[PDB]
């Protein structure tokens, strides 16, 4: 009992490591694949189930399925399998030796929290654990006490206004739009270009393509016009088979779905509009502080130029009499994990944990009252 | 200028006729065959290229090749040849006299549309034309405004949810599985029985066999068990040479590939699952209307008992508190052509056409914005 | 078997063997056999006297007194017609077949007699559902504890019906396994649309059972199924009754099946362990 | 708030169509609680309070504590984060600001109207709260007509039918000569 482990069950990726380290010791995607063919050879009875980078490597003969969908778990067996894999094969640390820290998106069903707590306390018999929010850990990592969080993850995008020493639970907005919808739209448009991708392996391929050759556009109409003069924007990517794919307008089209959800057919508003509404719902005095500080985190906000576009849109919507500043740290991918590690390292938090004795005597409902 | 011609480029059998008639005036398969041997006799310099029923009749000395593959054109010369044949030899109507209507599957590349429009406007100099979708024409033929289309053609199967006066472009699913894959699987299984078929002529023979002696099974396991008692299910077919082939389980095995794509090795879902997913992606209120109306069309959905199996599967998947109805008109083969003719006959559509002047001044990109 | 059946196949088989040779003259085939089924109830088939032309079937219901107090006049004419006679064995319902009269049907009668236990059990649940359906003042709640030390309670109020289950596990080995089994019962709902709510409680008995002298203790869990007319109408009544009655043996059988499954998995892993060991022997 | 809590249960509703659906659900399966803590405790024994509703798609939603939670926001505005007081407190403050003599008459007569006050038991809770706050030496009566939804329209029709009101109207001639400001002085 010297340190604690912080695990972030990201909608598309899993981050884990020791409390105190500045970088995670285990970064693998949440994939639980199973064989799709029959199998003929006799010298191998191997691993009916596959997880982790192994699944990514041999994805061509497996039906990859994401255990977590838009922030809510759908298959508990897959999640338990991934937990076991991360705890034993990668970390090689017994659950009893150290406690575990878990994080989840806001406005999630209580059933998921109760089931997760029960499984953690019963199966792995962890000495203690806790449940927190990714946005607050982002604040802790950023070393600030006031601001607005843009936690645009792979599965969920949400904002949580905060003020010095307190939060505003009544001004929390959660949007289902996230990286998965962007990937689906990218596949649909790549079909309109002439390239077809259906199965999950090509889903990973398109995910990589978007990760490598996508960016946001300051002006949509101007970019479309310059695309009409398509002689300096098209770029080529090399597929595993050697085929070359040329991508033009699709580079700056899919990211615009964030600001224009109507493309996918969702009757909602963009991230800028949702943040403006959330800040407006707050008290007048704290609006200045919230404008002066705007923290963003998540893997969906690494597109170059996103900060500039958000700043321009907010300034256009907001009155043109004050200053709006966007802060874009270059390590926002692991901000949640860093915040969790820092929070665990805090001396005052050594008593806020939830132990087996109190959990057993009280019941699973205790976590509900533990910091909401 | 009194009527218009509607041509449906099925990647299988092409359908054409005048606008107003209730039945097509030209129904021939899309075959562009060329001689495979050398040729010795001198009193013949005949037609290096062959098309239409002529190709079907003398298929034994020709390398038949389908110009259209899974809804996307691969050889433009063959398509232009078939267009010329249908326009002149069969219809005997000059392109200038009347306009032409064209239909294509959804989610097709824009390159195909632009090339088709350019060729039609340049080569045949048609006064005007238009591009539409087979499913909407199916709705027009069925005389309904709300429902879900099951357009399972020879090359592509797709669904397009619709509501009163509007469509849902974000809930369109296209499946490459179609009659050609079924024919290939039928050939493969006929090999396992003891009968071999490789070349294209035997491909046509097996296509006819499937058209004549295939049906769907309500229960797969029960049908297999009854096949174990193979004394009332086997049927005989007469080949052109006089040989008799006995077909047993293959009658109800190949159609099951539609509901079980895993047989061919495709990591996808069946038509029932895809329709369920498409309807679920729609708004809650319109789900009732979509369930109450389910239009199906295409040449791959004529197997007896298909409607009953689809109804049973959908009711099992859907909640058992409402009523699900399947509508199976006995003329679904030419539903697309009937819908196209009715749409052309509409007075309001006389102005939506695309003429040579506007096309030349604007460019091929105009068709892209014309009703998507 | 996955859903435990309700038709005891013993009676079906013996009646089929008897009737298939029925049209063979004066064939008495004297029969006297004693059986047993779930819920700790004993059956008995035996001719009333030396006259072998009549065969009798009887039951030894544990909670028979509650059934007699309630009154099952509905069951005396709906499913069973004139072939039911006063109890003989232990003051419990007993029927007999009149072979002298022509038996017209063969399968329907056998099937009807096969579900005797559930047929008699339904007399209370169906009547409570009728009470809440008919608009009659909510009949007084009742508690029906069968042979097992556990207890069953039902409340029939307006706009809905309720049922609660008490669970007792005897051997220390299966207590934890059953606890795990029932822990996930209250949550699995992602594959059911028109299904009732499910909850589990062991530490705090429900407030309904405080006054009732039902199963009360420490190592006893509770399961409640909320009932609504959408799944308790005249159409989906028999299925629900069969599912609830066969709940206990269903849990038991699937617990044993899980035990066999884990046995098979460990047996499979032993082979991998032996393969790893074999690295020590020389070539 | 009902949408937000339905999210905490496990059911999600965002767009306006589901807004109408939740509005209907509240209209059909909501009621007020005489005692909040006692109702919460009885909910802990959740075997007689949960109710089911049928959605248009056929899905069934089970609602428990949410039935008596959202209406309590009226008496506890702090749930939404508004720094104000409940309807009982506001009515008490309004009556107190009045003259002493008319307080008796105001207590003896308390008319309520609107579509947000049809929840069963609301009148009893309001009576209990007012009597607890007010001195326990007089009688407080709550009048809850069963047609309060259209009370405003009925009153408007009766006022229009009044003979004396046939001259209080505002006509085009006087409006044009005077201007839009006339309505401001017309009965405030």
């Amino acid at each position: 009992e010297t340190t604690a482990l912080v695990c972030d069950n990201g909608s598309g990726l899993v981050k884990a490591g020791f409390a105190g380290d500045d970088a995670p010791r285990a970064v693998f995607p949440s994939i639980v694949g199973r064989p799709r063919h029959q199998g003929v050879m006799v010298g191998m009875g191997q691993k009916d189930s596959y997880v982790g980078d192994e699944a990514q490597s041999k994805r061509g003969i497996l039906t990859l399925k994401y255990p977590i969908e838009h922030g809510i778990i759908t298959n508990w067996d897959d999640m338990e399998k991934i937990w076991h894999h991360t705890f034993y094969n990668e970390l090689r640390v017994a659950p009893e030796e150290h406690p575990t820290l878990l994080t989840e998106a806001p406005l999630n069903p209580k059933a998921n929290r109760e089931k997760m707590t029960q499984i953690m306390f019963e199966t792995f018999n962890v000495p203690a654990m806790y449940v927190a929010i990714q946005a607050v850990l982002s604040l802790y990592a950023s070393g600030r006490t006031t601001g607005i969080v843009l936690d645009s993850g792979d599965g969920v995008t949400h904002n949580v206004p905060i003020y010095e020493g307190y939060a505003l639970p009544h001004a929390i907005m959660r949007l289902d739009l996230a990286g998965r919808d962007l990937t689906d739209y990218l596949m649909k448009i790549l079909t309109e270009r002439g390239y077809s991708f259906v199965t999950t392996a090509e889903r990973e391929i398109v995910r990589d393509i978007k990760e490598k050759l996508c960016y946001v556009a300051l002006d949509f109409e101007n970019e479309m016009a310059t695309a009409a003069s398509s002689s300096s924007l098209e770029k080529s990517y090399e597929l595993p088979d050697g085929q070359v794919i040329t991508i033009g307008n699709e580079r700056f089209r899919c990211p615009e779905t964030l600001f224009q959800p109507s493309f996918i057919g969702m009757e909602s508003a963009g991230i800028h509009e949702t943040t403006y509404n959330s800040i407006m719902k707050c008290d007048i005095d704290i609006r200045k502080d919230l404008y002066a500080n705007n923290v963003m985190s998540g893997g969906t906000t690494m597109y170059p130029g996103i900060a500039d576009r958000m700043q321009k849109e907010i300034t256009a919507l907001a009155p043109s009499t004050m200053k709006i500043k966007i802060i874009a740290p270059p390590e926002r991918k692991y901000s949640v994990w860093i915040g969790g590690s820092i929070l665990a390292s805090l001396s005052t938090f050594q008593q806020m944990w939830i132990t087996k004795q109190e959990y057993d005597e009280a019941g699973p409902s205790i976590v509900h009252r533990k910091c909401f | 200028e009194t009527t218009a011609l509607v041509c449906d480029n099925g990647s299988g059998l092409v359908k054409a006729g005048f606008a107003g008639d209730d039945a097509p005036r030209a129904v021939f398969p899309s075959i562009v065959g060329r001689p495979r041997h050398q040729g010795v006799m001198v009193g013949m310099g005949q037609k290096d290229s062959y098309v239409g029923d002529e190709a079907q009749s003398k298929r034994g000395i020709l390398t038949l090749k389908y110009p259209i593959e899974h809804g996307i054109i691969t050889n433009w010369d063959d398509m232009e040849k078939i267009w010329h044949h249908t326009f002149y030899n069969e219809l005997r109507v000059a392109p200038e006299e009347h306009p032409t209507l064209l239909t294509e599957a959804p989610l097709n590349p824009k390159a195909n549309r632009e090339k088709m429009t350019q060729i039609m406007f340049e080569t045949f100099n048609v006064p005007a034309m238009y591009v539409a979708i087979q499913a909407v024409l199916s709705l027009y033929a069925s005389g309904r405004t709300t429902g879900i289309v099951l357009d399972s053609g020879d090359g592509v199967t797709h669904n397009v949810p619709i509501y009163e006066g509007y469509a849902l472009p974000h809930a369109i699913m296209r499946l490459d599985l179609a009659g050609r894959d079924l024919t290939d699987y039928l050939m493969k299984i006929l090999t396992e029985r003891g009968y071999s078929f490789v070349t294209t002529a035997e491909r046509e023979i097996v296509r006819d066999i499937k058209e004549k002696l295939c049906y769907v099974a309500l229960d797969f396991e029960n049908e297999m068990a009854t096949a174990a008692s193979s004394s009332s299910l086997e049927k005989s077919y007469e080949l052109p040479d006089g040989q008799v082939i006995t077909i047993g389980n293959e009658r109800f095995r190949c159609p099951e590939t539609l509901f079980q794509p895993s047989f061919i090795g495709m990591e996808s879902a069946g038509i029932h699952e895809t329709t369920y997913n498409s309807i679920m992606k729609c708004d809650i209120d319109i789900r009732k209307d979509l369930y109450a109306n389910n239009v199906m069309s295409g040449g791959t959905t004529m197997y007896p008992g298909i409607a009953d199996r689809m109804q049973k599967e959908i009711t099992a998947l859907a909640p058992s508190t409402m009523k699900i109805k399947i509508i199976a008109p006995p003329e679904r083969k030419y539903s697309v052509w009937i819908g196209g003719s009715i749409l052309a006959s509409l007075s309001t559509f006389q102005q939506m056409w695309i003429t040579k002047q506007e096309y030349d001044e604007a460019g091929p990109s105009i068709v892209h914005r014309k009703c998507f | 078997m996955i859903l435990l059946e309700v038709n005891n196949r013993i009676i079906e088989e013996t009646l089929a063997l008897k009737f298939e040779n029925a049209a063979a003259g004066n064939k008495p085939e004297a029969v006297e056999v004693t059986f047993a089924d779930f819920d700790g109830v004993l059956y008995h088939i035996s001719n009333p006297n030396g006259d072998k032309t009549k065969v009798m079937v009887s039951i030894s219901l544990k909670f028979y007194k509650e059934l007699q107090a309630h009154g099952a006049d509905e069951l005396l004419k709906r499913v069973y017609g004139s072939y039911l006679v006063n109890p003989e064995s232990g003051y419990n319902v007993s029927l007999l077949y009149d072979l002298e009269n022509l038996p017209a049907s063969k399968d329907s009668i056998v099937h009807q007699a096969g579900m005797l236990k559930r047929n008699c059990f339904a007399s209370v649940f169906e009547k409570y559902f009728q009470f809440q359906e008919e608009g009659k003042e909510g009949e007084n709640r009742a508690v029906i504890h069968y042979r097992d030390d556990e207890t069953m309670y039902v409340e029939s109020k307006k706009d809905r019906v309720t049922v609660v289950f008490s669970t007792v596990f005897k051997d220390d080995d299966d207590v934890v396994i059953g606890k795990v089994f029932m822990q996930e019962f209250k949550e699995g709902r992602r594959a059911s649309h028109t299904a009732p709510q499910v909850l589990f409680s062991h530490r705090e008995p429900p407030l309904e059972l405080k006054d009732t002298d039902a199963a009360v203790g420490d190592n006893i869990g509770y399961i409640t199924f909320v009932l609504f007319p959408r799944h308790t109408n005249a159409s989906a009544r028999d299925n629900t009754i069969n599912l609830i009655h066969t709940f206990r043996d269903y849990l038991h059988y699937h617990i044993k099946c899980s035990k066999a499954y884990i046995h098979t998995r460990m047996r499979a892993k032993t082979s991998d362990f032996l393969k790893v060991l074999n690295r020590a022997r020389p070539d | 708030y009902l949408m937000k809590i339905l999210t905490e249960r496990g059911y999600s509703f965002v767009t306006t169509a589901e807004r109408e659906i939740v509005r209907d659900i509240k209209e059909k399966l909501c009621y007020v609680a005489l005692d909040f803590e006692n109702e919460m405790a009885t909910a802990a024994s959740s075997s007689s309070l949960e109710k089911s509703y049928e959605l248009p798609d056929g899905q069934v939603i089970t609602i428990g504590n949410e039935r008596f939670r959202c209406p309590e926001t009226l008496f506890q505005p702090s749930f939404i984060g508004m720094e104000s007081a409940g309807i009982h407190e506001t009515t008490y403050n309004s009556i107190m600001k009045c003259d002493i003599d008319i307080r008796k008459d105001l207590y003896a007569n308390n008319v309520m109207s609107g579509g947000t006050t049809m929840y069963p038991g609301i009148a009893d809770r309001m009576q209990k709260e007012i009597t607890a706050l007010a001195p326990s030496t007089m009688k407080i009566k709550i009048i809850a007509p069963p047609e309060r939804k259209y009370s405003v329209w009925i009153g408007g029709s009766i006022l229009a039918s009044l003979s004396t009101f046939q001259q209080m109207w505002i006509t085009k001639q006087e409006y044009d000569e005077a201007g839009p400001s006339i309505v401001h002085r017309k009965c405030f």
Binding site: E69, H70, G71, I72, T74, D176 | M280, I284 | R189, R190 | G10, Y11, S12, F13, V14, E18, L55, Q59, I61
Partner: peptide, 7 residues
């Protein structure tokens, strides 16, 4: 999800 959206 259970109602609305899939999850």
């Amino acid at each position: 999800w259970x109602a609305x959206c899939p999850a």
